[PDB]
Every structure is written in C-alpha cells, then in structure tokens.
C-alpha cells in the first residue's frame, strides 16, 4: 500500500538527515584541524628565521641557509594545507546547501503525502456516507405489508363466500317483520 | 500515494455507478414537493 511506502520513506528520511549532520560535523572537524595545523606551521618558519638571525649575528651562514631550508619547507606545506582548506570549505558549503535543500524535500514530501492521505481517507468516508444513505434497507418491509395485504384479500374472498351463501328464504320473513313494524307505526298514529 | 489515488478512482467509479442509477420517477414527486412549497410561499404572501 502507498500509505506504508510513503510512511517508510518518511522514516528513511529521518536517518538520512542525521548522517549528513555527522558528515558536516566531520567536515567541521577536518577544517578546524588544518586551520590549527597551518597556523602553527606559519609560525615555525618565523622561529627558524630567528635561528638565522642568530646566525646573522656572527658567522654561521650555513645555519642561516639551513633555517631557510626549514622556512621553504614550511611555507610550501602551508600553501598545500591552504589549498586543502579551500577544498573542505567548498565541500562543507556543498553539504550545507545540500542538507538545507534535502531538509526542504523531506518536510514537504512528508507533510504533503500525509494531508493527501488524510483527505483521500476523508473523501472515501464522505462517499461511504452518501452510499449508505442510498443503501437504506427499511424499504424491504413492503413484503410484510404485501404479506398482510394477501390476507386481506383472503378475508374478502371469505366475505364473497359468506355473502353469496347469505341469500335465503328468511328474506321473506323480514318483510313480515317490517309488516309487523308498520303495525306499531299504525298504532303510533293512533296514539297521535 | 499512487496506491491511494487508485482507490479514489474506485470511489469515483462507484460514484458513476451510484449516480447513474439515481435517476427514478421520484424526480416527479419532487416537483410535487416544490409545488407544495409554493403554497407556503403563497400563504407567506397572504401573511404579508
């Protein structure tokens, strides 16, 4: 799943930045050393130059020239170290700028994926809500109402059977009942 | 992110299936609902 891969890459980025910090710190250490080394070296030539000044006092031109020999050796080393120090300074800034750029990549890459994942998860959640609203199943009760409706028709069918058989000669006796009813109405007129 | 993106398309495909089936005669009943809505607006004019 992209979620795990994106998360893992984010986790990996955590390791990378630490290493570059160490590399920079290593670079800081190296430049400091050559700075320390070259600084003292420049002075040693002065010290031996002083040894020549003692020779300049009396006689030992050999010592003076010897002192120059150390002087020549030291200055060459300082130039070489000065050249070396330039490389570290350039390299140090390269890593520094590379680290700065790398940090931007990690931050934006991490956050953008997370929000994308969050909204994507939100998107499906909203879609599910709409689907479920359409997926409401209470309409299935129509079968139950249909079931009862059939029973009603059965009662109507029973009513058809009940009503059709109702016809009998008794209907004639009702006319007698109504005929007798008129008698009380006739007697009611007598009371009136 | 590509993996999730495919899922989004699946939801859109589901939306296509959901939306296409949505059409029903019920739409006519909405006109009745809106027609009844005008009655209260007409009654609202009566109150005015």
Tab-separated table of C-alpha atoms in Angstrom:
chain	number	residue	atom	x	y	z
A	1	UNK	CA	0.000	0.000	0.000
A	2	UNK	CA	1.240	3.535	-0.732
A	3	UNK	CA	0.455	4.508	2.872
A	4	UNK	CA	3.145	2.176	4.210
A	5	UNK	CA	5.630	3.002	1.439
A	6	UNK	CA	5.129	6.743	1.904
A	7	UNK	CA	5.440	6.364	5.677
A	8	UNK	CA	8.551	4.195	5.335
A	9	UNK	CA	10.201	6.709	3.006
A	10	UNK	CA	9.432	9.404	5.580
A	11	UNK	CA	11.037	7.208	8.246
A	12	UNK	CA	14.062	6.702	5.996
A	13	UNK	CA	14.422	10.467	5.557
A	14	UNK	CA	14.864	10.719	9.327
A	15	UNK	CA	18.004	8.586	9.078
A	16	UNK	CA	19.486	10.461	6.114
A	17	UNK	CA	19.435	13.919	7.702
A	18	UNK	CA	21.298	12.641	10.769
A	19	UNK	CA	24.087	11.157	8.644
A	20	UNK	CA	24.590	14.390	6.707
A	21	UNK	CA	24.806	16.242	10.018
A	22	UNK	CA	27.588	13.845	11.011
A	23	UNK	CA	29.314	14.362	7.662
A	24	UNK	CA	29.101	18.132	8.133
A	25	UNK	CA	30.370	17.792	11.701
A	26	UNK	CA	33.199	15.643	10.360
A	27	UNK	CA	33.865	18.375	7.799
A	28	UNK	CA	33.898	20.975	10.583
A	29	UNK	CA	36.445	18.869	12.458
A	30	UNK	CA	38.698	18.488	9.416
A	31	UNK	CA	38.750	22.195	8.559
A	32	UNK	CA	39.474	23.090	12.185
A	33	UNK	CA	42.485	20.763	12.250
A	34	UNK	CA	44.103	22.120	9.086
A	35	UNK	CA	43.390	25.626	10.368
A	36	UNK	CA	45.161	24.671	13.595
A	37	UNK	CA	47.925	22.905	11.664
A	38	UNK	CA	48.589	25.710	9.184
A	39	UNK	CA	48.503	28.422	11.853
A	40	UNK	CA	51.311	26.931	13.938
A	41	UNK	CA	53.292	25.954	10.836
A	42	UNK	CA	53.405	29.563	9.637
A	43	UNK	CA	54.999	30.473	12.970
A	44	UNK	CA	57.647	27.735	12.905
A	45	UNK	CA	59.192	29.359	9.833
A	46	UNK	CA	59.434	32.569	11.847
A	47	UNK	CA	61.098	30.647	14.679
A	48	UNK	CA	63.725	29.155	12.379
A	49	UNK	CA	64.007	32.572	10.752
A	50	UNK	CA	65.018	33.760	14.223
A	51	UNK	CA	67.624	30.993	14.374
A	52	UNK	CA	69.053	32.549	11.212
A	53	UNK	CA	69.085	35.953	12.909
A	54	UNK	CA	71.389	34.376	15.483
A	55	UNK	CA	73.490	33.245	12.531
A	56	UNK	CA	73.174	36.760	11.117
A	57	UNK	CA	74.769	37.883	14.382
A	58	UNK	CA	78.038	36.069	13.644
A	59	UNK	CA	79.374	33.534	11.193
A	60	UNK	CA	77.084	30.569	10.635
A	61	UNK	CA	75.673	31.354	7.213
A	62	UNK	CA	75.140	27.593	6.964
A	63	UNK	CA	72.744	27.820	9.907
A	64	UNK	CA	71.029	30.781	8.245
A	65	UNK	CA	70.650	28.892	4.966
A	66	UNK	CA	69.640	25.793	6.925
A	67	UNK	CA	66.978	27.890	8.649
A	68	UNK	CA	65.807	28.973	5.197
A	69	UNK	CA	65.546	25.294	4.265
A	70	UNK	CA	63.016	24.793	7.053
A	71	UNK	CA	61.391	28.074	6.024
A	72	UNK	CA	60.991	26.885	2.432
A	73	UNK	CA	59.627	23.519	3.556
A	74	UNK	CA	57.108	25.046	5.967
A	75	UNK	CA	55.708	27.671	3.590
A	76	UNK	CA	55.148	25.008	0.932
A	77	UNK	CA	53.233	22.916	3.467
A	78	UNK	CA	51.147	25.946	4.437
A	79	UNK	CA	50.267	26.563	0.791
A	80	UNK	CA	49.334	22.901	0.360
A	81	UNK	CA	47.269	22.988	3.553
A	82	UNK	CA	45.800	26.330	2.486
A	83	UNK	CA	44.779	24.661	-0.773
A	84	UNK	CA	43.390	21.714	1.195
A	85	UNK	CA	41.447	24.043	3.494
A	86	UNK	CA	39.807	25.639	0.453
A	87	UNK	CA	38.526	22.247	-0.702
A	88	UNK	CA	36.962	21.495	2.683
A	89	UNK	CA	35.345	24.935	2.821
A	90	UNK	CA	33.846	24.426	-0.637
A	91	UNK	CA	32.825	20.865	0.230
A	92	UNK	CA	31.439	21.988	3.592
A	93	UNK	CA	29.149	24.539	1.946
A	94	UNK	CA	28.132	21.955	-0.657
A	95	UNK	CA	26.932	19.596	2.074
A	96	UNK	CA	25.443	22.527	3.990
A	97	UNK	CA	23.447	23.647	0.955
A	98	UNK	CA	22.695	20.017	0.092
A	99	UNK	CA	21.475	19.489	3.655
A	100	UNK	CA	19.340	22.638	3.531
A	101	UNK	CA	17.775	21.549	0.243
A	102	UNK	CA	17.410	17.972	1.491
A	103	UNK	CA	15.551	19.188	4.579
A	104	UNK	CA	13.043	21.038	2.394
A	105	UNK	CA	12.411	17.903	0.329
A	106	UNK	CA	11.820	15.804	3.446
A	107	UNK	CA	9.476	18.288	5.121
A	108	UNK	CA	7.296	18.972	2.083
A	109	UNK	CA	7.340	15.349	0.928
A	110	UNK	CA	6.294	14.110	4.368
A	111	UNK	CA	3.556	16.665	5.025
A	112	UNK	CA	2.064	16.686	1.517
A	113	UNK	CA	1.639	12.908	1.466
A	114	UNK	CA	0.073	12.884	4.936
A	115	UNK	CA	-2.516	15.538	4.091
A	116	UNK	CA	-3.147	13.836	0.748
A	117	UNK	CA	-3.671	10.569	2.621
A	118	UNK	CA	-5.915	12.285	5.174
A	119	UNK	CA	-8.099	13.989	2.565
A	120	UNK	CA	-8.163	10.816	0.467
A	121	UNK	CA	-9.372	8.936	3.540
A	122	UNK	CA	-11.851	11.752	4.156
A	123	UNK	CA	-13.006	11.524	0.537
A	124	UNK	CA	-13.934	7.842	0.786
A	125	UNK	CA	-15.558	8.447	4.174
A	126	UNK	CA	-17.827	11.084	2.627
A	127	UNK	CA	-18.560	8.810	-0.336
A	128	UNK	CA	-19.474	5.966	2.019
A	129	UNK	CA	-21.917	8.270	3.816
A	130	UNK	CA	-23.657	9.116	0.542
A	131	UNK	CA	-23.730	5.450	-0.496
A	132	UNK	CA	-25.192	4.329	2.833
A	133	UNK	CA	-27.931	6.972	2.674
A	134	UNK	CA	-28.993	5.497	-0.660
A	135	UNK	CA	-28.441	1.988	0.678
A	136	UNK	CA	-31.076	2.229	3.400
A	137	UNK	CA	-32.868	-1.111	3.578
A	138	UNK	CA	-36.038	-0.342	5.545
A	139	UNK	CA	-37.955	-0.443	2.245
A	140	UNK	CA	-37.828	-4.255	2.437
A	141	UNK	CA	-40.847	-4.154	4.772
A	142	UNK	CA	-43.069	-3.921	1.677
A	143	UNK	CA	-43.059	-7.726	1.661
A	144	UNK	CA	-44.520	-7.739	5.182
A	145	UNK	CA	-47.207	-5.247	4.160
A	146	UNK	CA	-47.654	-7.301	0.994
A	147	UNK	CA	-47.971	-10.411	3.173
A	148	UNK	CA	-50.766	-8.847	5.230
A	149	UNK	CA	-52.369	-7.466	2.066
A	150	UNK	CA	-52.777	-11.011	0.739
A	151	UNK	CA	-54.518	-11.957	3.986
A	152	UNK	CA	-56.942	-9.062	3.486
A	153	UNK	CA	-57.792	-10.479	0.060
A	154	UNK	CA	-58.340	-13.850	1.740
A	155	UNK	CA	-60.844	-12.190	4.074
A	156	UNK	CA	-62.521	-10.535	1.082
A	157	UNK	CA	-62.643	-13.943	-0.601
A	158	UNK	CA	-64.175	-15.307	2.601
A	159	UNK	CA	-66.619	-12.393	2.510
A	160	UNK	CA	-67.504	-13.375	-1.059
A	161	UNK	CA	-68.187	-16.919	0.147
A	162	UNK	CA	-70.007	-15.606	3.222
A	163	UNK	CA	-72.069	-13.063	1.291
A	164	UNK	CA	-73.075	-15.341	-1.582
A	165	UNK	CA	-74.486	-18.016	0.739
A	166	UNK	CA	-76.334	-15.423	2.837
A	167	UNK	CA	-79.310	-15.417	0.464
A	168	UNK	CA	-82.166	-17.491	1.897
A	169	UNK	CA	-85.941	-17.559	2.153
A	170	UNK	CA	-85.523	-15.800	5.506
A	171	UNK	CA	-85.627	-12.581	3.479
A	172	UNK	CA	-89.377	-13.127	3.115
A	173	UNK	CA	-89.709	-13.306	6.905
A	174	UNK	CA	-88.061	-9.882	7.138
A	175	UNK	CA	-90.936	-8.480	5.079
A	176	UNK	CA	-93.245	-9.930	7.729
A	177	UNK	CA	-91.053	-8.296	10.375
A	178	UNK	CA	-91.299	-4.976	8.538
A	179	UNK	CA	-95.019	-5.586	8.015
A	180	UNK	CA	-95.405	-6.028	11.773
A	181	UNK	CA	-93.274	-2.908	12.238
A	182	UNK	CA	-95.891	-0.902	10.359
A	183	UNK	CA	-98.479	-2.049	12.895
A	184	UNK	CA	-96.714	-0.205	15.714
A	185	UNK	CA	-96.350	2.774	13.380
A	186	UNK	CA	-100.085	2.481	12.732
A	187	UNK	CA	-100.607	2.220	16.490
A	188	UNK	CA	-98.220	5.162	16.825
A	189	UNK	CA	-100.559	7.105	14.546
A	190	UNK	CA	-103.425	6.005	16.799
A	191	UNK	CA	-101.560	7.470	19.777
A	192	UNK	CA	-101.072	10.657	17.743
B	1	UNK	CA	0.199	7.944	-2.903
B	2	UNK	CA	-0.359	6.209	-6.239
B	3	UNK	CA	-1.960	3.311	-4.353
B	4	UNK	CA	-4.421	5.632	-2.607
B	5	UNK	CA	-5.001	7.521	-5.860
B	6	UNK	CA	-6.272	4.319	-7.480
B	7	UNK	CA	-8.707	3.899	-4.589
B	8	UNK	CA	-10.006	7.422	-5.220
B	9	UNK	CA	-10.704	6.427	-8.824
B	10	UNK	CA	-12.524	3.365	-7.483
B	11	UNK	CA	-14.726	5.678	-5.415
B	12	UNK	CA	-15.317	7.847	-8.490
B	13	UNK	CA	-16.221	4.692	-10.411
B	14	UNK	CA	-18.583	3.810	-7.563
B	15	UNK	CA	-19.959	7.349	-7.793
B	16	UNK	CA	-20.534	6.779	-11.512
B	17	UNK	CA	-22.459	3.607	-10.670
B	18	UNK	CA	-24.243	5.358	-7.799
B	19	UNK	CA	-25.088	8.467	-9.817
B	20	UNK	CA	-26.285	6.691	-12.957
B	21	UNK	CA	-28.800	4.547	-11.056
B	22	UNK	CA	-30.060	7.543	-9.063
B	23	UNK	CA	-32.478	8.546	-11.827
B	24	UNK	CA	-36.023	7.449	-10.964
B	25	UNK	CA	-39.625	8.574	-11.252
B	26	UNK	CA	-39.215	10.033	-7.757
B	27	UNK	CA	-37.998	13.165	-9.544
B	28	UNK	CA	-41.627	13.843	-10.474
B	29	UNK	CA	-42.589	13.691	-6.792
B	30	UNK	CA	-40.021	16.412	-6.084
B	31	UNK	CA	-41.961	18.698	-8.425
B	32	UNK	CA	-44.991	17.993	-6.239
B	33	UNK	CA	-42.845	18.788	-3.199
B	34	UNK	CA	-41.761	22.057	-4.812
B	35	UNK	CA	-45.356	22.667	-5.899
B	36	UNK	CA	-46.445	22.284	-2.275
B	37	UNK	CA	-43.554	24.559	-1.292
B	38	UNK	CA	-45.093	27.332	-3.375
B	39	UNK	CA	-48.274	27.005	-1.320
B	40	UNK	CA	-46.490	28.131	1.845
B	41	UNK	CA	-44.861	30.895	-0.195
B	42	UNK	CA	-48.353	31.814	-1.386
B	43	UNK	CA	-49.514	31.645	2.232
B	44	UNK	CA	-46.417	33.672	3.110
B	45	UNK	CA	-47.652	36.307	0.666
B	46	UNK	CA	-51.035	36.119	2.407
B	47	UNK	CA	-49.299	36.850	5.716
B	48	UNK	CA	-47.537	39.765	4.003
